[PDB]
Scaffold this active site. Structure first.
Site, PDB file in Angstrom:
ATOM      1  N   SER A 106      -4.218  -4.322   4.527  1.00 19.20           N
ATOM      2  CA  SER A 106      -3.328  -3.641   5.479  1.00 19.20           C
ATOM      3  C   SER A 106      -3.999  -3.627   6.842  1.00 19.20           C
ATOM      4  CB  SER A 106      -2.939  -2.287   4.884  1.00 19.20           C
ATOM      5  OG  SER A 106      -1.950  -1.673   5.694  1.00 19.20           O
ATOM      6  N   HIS A 155       2.995  -3.716  -0.871  1.00 25.90           N
ATOM      7  CA  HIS A 155       2.035  -3.559   0.226  1.00 25.90           C
ATOM      8  C   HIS A 155       0.642  -3.447  -0.379  1.00 25.90           C
ATOM      9  CE1 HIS A 155       0.719  -2.940   4.284  1.00 25.90           C
ATOM     10  NE2 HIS A 155       0.262  -1.719   4.065  1.00 25.90           N
ATOM     11  N   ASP A 202       7.000  -7.372   3.064  1.00 29.00           N
ATOM     12  CA  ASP A 202       5.985  -6.331   3.060  1.00 29.00           C
ATOM     13  C   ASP A 202       6.595  -4.975   3.448  1.00 29.00           C
ATOM     14  OD1 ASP A 202       2.803  -5.866   3.306  1.00 29.00           O
ATOM     15  OD2 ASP A 202       3.913  -4.790   4.872  1.00 29.00           O
TER      16      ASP A 202
END
Ligand SMILES: c1cc2c(cc1CNC[C@H]1CCCO1)OCO2
Ligand SMILES: c1cc2c(cc1CNC[C@H]1CCCO1)OCO2
Ligand SMILES: *[C@@H]1O[C@H](CO)[C@@H](O)[C@H](O)[C@H]1NC(C)=O
EC number: 3.1.1.98
Length: 352
Positions: free
Chosen positions: A145, A298, A253
């Site tokens: 991330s 994610h 995502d």
């Protein structure tokens, strides 16, 4: 278990001035090193950093960190959970700078917070060279991330740092997970007046000034003063990098959909979602090391069940192993894996 070490250089700090640090598990029989960057959004002005300090304080301070962490996924030392690099030296670097790992600014009379992400990585590398990293053959800088974007911003700086310190033989590589975002048209629009209404392009432009943020030099030279925010977007910064970088990105995502203001799907949103998948696939067409499944998710690489998802029959740990072999085309050992089907979960191996 990985064991906490706080940085000996006390001037390199988390947001609130407490020392930054790293968790380490050595593997003395191995010359491979994995340095993982944690993610978790960012803050870009005084008011939203103050709010983050009340309810997300482990992302701004080492004061409450535990002495140990269990390695999971690619940080696991068990081959059952980690087919790729189970025997490597493992390092987890906590994200306590709220700056997408870009900052170079100390707390001072004019700065309530320190934003030192780019300097935290540099000091971790320095102190590890006295704990065995001097004998490494490969250093893989990985992250998820915001930490995946951090890989893109910092991998060539780690390579330059090791060359200048007299270790040109260590091969530096990057693994960016869930950090390849698009500065695309949003599904619904809000002008930037506060934290939640500010699109990433506007938020990062302000953040760079607040953080004294730093981007890779070749990308900085392309976009120039005032336009450094462009280098936080993978398809723009990746062509400027010299180190080998493997890109992991879900085609749909959840964080991308959040910043696009997307949450019974009718035609307008169906077309919007399908176009996002197409645009992401297009930006990866000429990325030779990549893994991009058609799922709504994610992060993946430190999840314990990261071995489950497959593209064209090939798992992510296998693709990373094929990448290793290619850096010594391989029959039955692919490195570029991008789904072509156009809707979330059209791949049956997507996480539930
Ligand atoms: C003081 C000043 C600050 C701050 C937070 C503080 C509160 N004390 C934090 C110390 C206690 C444990 C480790 O750091 O955020 C930015 O400026
Ligand atoms: C991170 C880094 C980025 C980025 C976008 C992100 C995503 N973080 C914002 C999301 C997190 C949860 C809710 O809003 O654009 C390029 O750099
Ligand atoms: C500590 O870190 C700061 C910030 O990068 C640097 O300027 C300084 O030289 C470092 N000190 C030592 C002893 O490494």
């Amino acid at each position: 278990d990985l064991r906490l070490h706080l940085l000996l250089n006390t001037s390199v700090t988390c947001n609130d001035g407490s020392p930054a640090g790293y968790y380490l598990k050595e593997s003395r029989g191995s010359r491979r090193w994995l340095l993982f960057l944690e993610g978790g959004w960012y803050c870009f002005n005084r008011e939203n950093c103050d709010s983050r300090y009340d309810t997300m304080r482990r992302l701004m301070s080492s004061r409450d960190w535990p002495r140990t962490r269990t390695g999971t996924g690619i940080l696991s030392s068990q081959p059952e959970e980690n087919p790729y690099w189970w025997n490597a030296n493992m390092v987890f670097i906590p994200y306590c700078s709220s700056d997408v790992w870009s900052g170079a600014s100390s707390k001072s009379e004019k700065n309530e917070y320190a934003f030192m992400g780019a300097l935290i990585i540099q000091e971790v590398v320095r102190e590890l060279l006295g704990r065995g990293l001097s004998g490494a053959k490969v250093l893989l800088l990985a992250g998820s991330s915001a930490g995946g974007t951090g890989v893109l911003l910092n991998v060539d700086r780690v390579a330059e740092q090791l060359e200048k310190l007299g270790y040109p033989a260590i091969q530096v590589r990057g693994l960016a997970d869930s950090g390849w975002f698009l500065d695309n048209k949003q599904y619904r629009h809000t002008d930037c007046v506060d934290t939640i209404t500010c699109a990433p392009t506007e938020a990062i432009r302000r953040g760079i000034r607040y953080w004294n943020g730093v981007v890779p030099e070749r990308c900085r030279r392309q976009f120039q003063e005032g336009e450094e925010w462009n280098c936080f977007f993978g398809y723009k910064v990746y062509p400027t990098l010299r180190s080998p970088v493997f890109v992991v990105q879900w085609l749909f995502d959840e964080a991308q959909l959040t910043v696009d203001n997307v949450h019974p799907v009718q035609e307008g949103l169906r077309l919007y979602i399908q176009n996002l998948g197409r645009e992401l696939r297009h930006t990866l067409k000429d990325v030779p090391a990549s893994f991009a499944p058609a799922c709504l998710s994610h992060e993946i690489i430190i999840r314990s069940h990261w071995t489950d998802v497959q593209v064209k029959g090939t798992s992510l740990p296998r693709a990373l192993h094929c990448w290793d072999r290619s850096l010594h085309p391989l029959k039955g050992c692919p490195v570029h894996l991008v789904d072509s089907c156009p809707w979330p979960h059209c791949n049956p191996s997507c996480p539930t």
